[PDB]
Amino acid sequence: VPAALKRLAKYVIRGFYGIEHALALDILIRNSCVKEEDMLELLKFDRKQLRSVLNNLKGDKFIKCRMRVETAADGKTTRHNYYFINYRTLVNVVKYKLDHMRRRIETDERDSTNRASFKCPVCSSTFTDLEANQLFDPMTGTFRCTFCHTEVEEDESAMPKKDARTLLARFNEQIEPIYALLRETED
Amino acid sequence: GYKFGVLAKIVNYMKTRHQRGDTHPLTLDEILDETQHLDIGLKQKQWLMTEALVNNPKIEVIDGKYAFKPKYNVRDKKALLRLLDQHDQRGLGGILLEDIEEALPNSQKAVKALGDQILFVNRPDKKKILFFNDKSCQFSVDEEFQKLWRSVTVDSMDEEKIEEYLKRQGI
Ligand SMILES: [Zn+2]
Numbered sequence: 638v639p640a641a642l643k644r645l646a647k648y649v650i651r652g653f654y655g656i657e658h659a660l661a662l663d664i665l666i667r668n669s670c671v672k673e674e675d676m677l678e679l680l681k682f683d684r685k686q687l688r689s690v691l692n693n694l695k696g697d698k699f700i701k702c703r704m705r706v707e708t709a710a711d712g713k714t715t716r717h718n719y720y721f722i723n724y725r726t727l728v729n730v731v732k733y734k735l736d737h738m739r740r741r742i743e744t745d746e747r748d749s750t751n752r753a754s755f756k757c758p759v760c761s762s763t764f765t766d767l768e769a770n771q772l773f774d775p776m777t778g779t780f781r782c783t784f785c786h787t788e789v790e791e792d793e794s795a796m797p798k799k800d801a802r803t804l805l806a807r808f809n810e811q812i813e814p815i816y817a818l819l820r821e822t823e824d
Numbered sequence: 825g826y827k828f829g830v831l832a833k834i835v836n837y838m839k840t841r842h843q844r845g846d847t848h849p850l851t852l853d854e855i856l857d858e859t860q861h862l863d864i865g866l867k868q869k870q871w872l873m874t875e876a877l878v879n880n881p882k883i884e885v886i887d888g889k890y891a892f893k894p895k896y897n898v899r900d901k902k903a904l905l906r907l908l909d910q911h912d913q914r915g916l917g918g919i920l921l922e923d924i925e926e927a928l929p930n931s932q933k934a935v936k937a938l939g940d941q942i943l944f945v946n947r948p949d950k951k952k953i954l955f956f957n958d959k960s961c962q963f964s965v966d967e968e969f970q971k972l973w974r975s976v977t978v979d980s981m982d983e984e985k986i987e988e989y990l991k992r993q994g995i
Pocket residue numbers: 757759760781782783784785786787
């Protein structure tokens with residue numbers, strides 16, 4: 638178990654997820670294979686909260702659980718769920734999320750231009766640019782909506798593109814350490 | 825009723841006596857004098873000496889005599905800080921706020937002095953659990969970013985499409 642995988646896992650769990658998930662991942666780092674009741678006592682959480690956290694973790698599939706059943710001294714069955722860290726799936730899901738965000742950047746860039754530039758405050762609904770000609774009245778000499786018949790201001794769509802552009806720089810700056818850590822974890 | 829009731833009385837009496845600042849240890853007869861237990865049985869005495877004042881974590885055994893245990897409990901900010909550091913290092917977990925509140929009178933001063941070092945976990949029943957803020961690696965994201973992450977659904981999305989996407993984007 639190279640320390641690079643552990644460091645990358647700690648960085649992503651601390652940055653993207655809360656302290657409870659970081660504590661769970663640290664527990665799983667200290668011991669490779671851990672029973673479901675083992676991380677139930679030494680953290681002092683409610684059962685429901687830990688179960689929800691484990692449900693989310695199994696949703697993102699950072700670790701893997703194997704089913705084991707056995708017998709007890711008194712004769713009753715014992716159903717212990719054994720959880721173990723799987724870095725092979727962890728790196729794959731991390732890379733999947735990474736490229737998903739990467740393509741989300743370009744889709745957001747395209748959608749910023751695709752947003753309608755016509756808005757009617759009377760009805761408070763976006764109006765597509767193409768149908769603005771349909772709304773326009775040739776005999777009036779000026780453009781207005783057919784429903785409310787009010788002037789349309791196109792300056793309300795100016796700031797979200799600039800806001801997104803500003804966030805692009807911050808996203809690109811903060812995402813670099815993850816790519817830096819990825820290179821050493823390839824082998 | 826016998827052999828099981830007076831233990832609560834004596835432990836409460838010695839706890840309240842320590843609350844008055846009596847750090848010095850006291851002999852058993854010293855407590856028995858003012859607790860109106862002069863008719864206590866000898867077997868009760870030896871059972872007390874052998875089990876009651878040695879098994880509980882609140883009684884200290886020093887120079888043969890018995891006293892409080894203020895070192896184990898929290899009485900200052902530094903004790904809370906080092907206890908929390910030990911909990912974080914050994915992974916023993918947190919501690920209920922009520923234990924510190926009853927151990928440390930006016931514990932809010934230490935809490936507000938620590939500030940961001942102390943972390944609170946809000947239970948449904950208003951109880952708070954205290955954790956240490958491990959500052960090994962800290963990173964935060966914008967609320968808009970967090971909303972963006974929450975918008976994408978992944979729990980209802982299987983393992984065939986996850987690896988199909990990788991080759992779709994050509995990475
Ligand atoms: Zn209109």
